Structure 1
Amino acid sequence: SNIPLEELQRNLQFHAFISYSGHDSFWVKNELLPNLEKEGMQICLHERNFVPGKSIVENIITCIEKSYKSIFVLSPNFVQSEWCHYELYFAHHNLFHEGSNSLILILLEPIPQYSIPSSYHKLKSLMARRTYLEWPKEKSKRGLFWANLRAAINIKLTEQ
């Protein structure tokens, strides 16, 4: 019931790469990863999988290149401690060709406008699309979130 990565055009190793902030580690390790790995998905994680002897940027790009999708756990913590790596890399490399299925945005916590610096142009461009999956506060809507998340991971990539 999951995408066979070996039957893809590229030699991908993971179904999705999860980029998150350390301050959001509890939800990622007790909700995100359990719900994805129990379904049989291979996850490139921000903590593990990173190879020693390389920079943090190289480890992130390596996880992205070996993953069918990339997941950003958007939150005030993610903006202040994680997004800068992507804002700097997007200024020179546009590997996510705009409107593409490659990037999946999870809004774990609402991001206030004041906490977003005026220099994070790509972050404002991504959140303006209103295509992110919001973590619901109601427990009854949790099952809808996971169904939407697994679908976003397993949907066919748009031609980019």
Structure 2
Amino acid sequence: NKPFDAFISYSEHDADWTKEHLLKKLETDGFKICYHERDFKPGHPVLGNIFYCIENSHKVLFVLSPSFVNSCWCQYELYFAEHRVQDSLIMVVLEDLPPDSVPQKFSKLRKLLKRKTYLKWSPEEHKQKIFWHQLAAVLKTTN
């Protein structure tokens, strides 16, 4: 029984979409989210380290796009979650990733993408409505 439903990570390039769509919808619908842009407090002994969100969240959710995979900072975030975290991972593909673009040593993300375990965003309202129900569903699954 973690206090947060998900720790969410996303690239700077995807920040506007994530805040305006993903975060807003999830929080309006009652999910409790931990994310560093809001919840990391530099110098705070509890809130100012990177273990806080992931240790207190049921799921880890990554927003995936080329900008995420090619970002130095996002690769560090991927490394951390891969080595800290399993069924607790949730991948949202916002934009298609070119084949073999994920660095070879990110075995977990590679196998998860290869095995089609992600949810994919769509521009069409009908597919988006399904997306949001399926995202809520996967956030509530066991680990």
TM-score for both structures, normalised by structure 2: 0.85
Structure 1 residue 124, shift from structure 2 partner: 1.2
- Map residues 54-133 of structure 1 onto 2, 5 A cutoff: 59-81=49-71, 82-89=73-80, 93=83, 95-97=84-86, 100=87, 102-113=88-99, 115-133=101-119
> Hey, what does 2:16 align to over in structure 1?
26
State the Cα deviation string for residues 38-59 of structure 1 (Å, max 9, x = none): 11111101311113138xxx84
- Asked if the contact 1:107–1:133 (Cα under 8 Å) also holds between the matched residues in 2, the reply is yes
Q: For the structure 1 residues 90 and 18, does the alpha-carbon distance in structure 2 shift closer, same or farther, using more than 3 Å as the test?
A: closer
> Hey, what does 2:42 align to over in structure 1?
52
- Asked if the contact 1:19–1:45 (Cα under 8 Å) also holds between the matched residues in 2, the reply is yes
Structure 1 residue 13, shift from structure 2 partner: 1.9
- Asked if the contact 1:20–1:46 (Cα under 8 Å) also holds between the matched residues in 2, the reply is no
3-state SS of paired residue (1:136): coil
> Hey, what does 2:129 align to over in structure 1?
143
Partner Cα separation in structure 1 for residue 129 and residue 118 of structure 2? 16
Q: Which amino acid aligns with 1:130?
A: K
Q: What is the aligned-residue RMSD (CA, Å)? A: 2.1
Partner Cα separation in structure 1 for residue 90 and residue 15 of structure 2? 18
> Hey, what does 1:13 align to over in structure 2?
3
Q: Which amino acid aligns with 1:123?
A: L
Q: For the structure 1 residues 53 and 146, does the alpha-carbon distance in structure 2 shift closer, same or farther, using more than 3 Å as the test?
A: same
State the Cα deviation string for residues 45-98 of structure 1 (Å, max 9, x = none): 1311113138xxx8443211110111010111111124421454367x3x433x
- Which structure has the larger Rg? 1
- Asked if the contact 2:91–2:118 (Cα under 8 Å) also holds between the matched residues in 1, the reply is yes
TM-score for both structures, normalised by structure 1: 0.77
Identity of aligned residues (%): 45
Q: For the structure 1 residues 147 and 110, does the alpha-carbon distance in structure 2 shift closer, same or farther, using more than 3 Å as the test?
A: same
Partner Cα separation in structure 2 for residue 16 and residue 141 of structure 1? 23
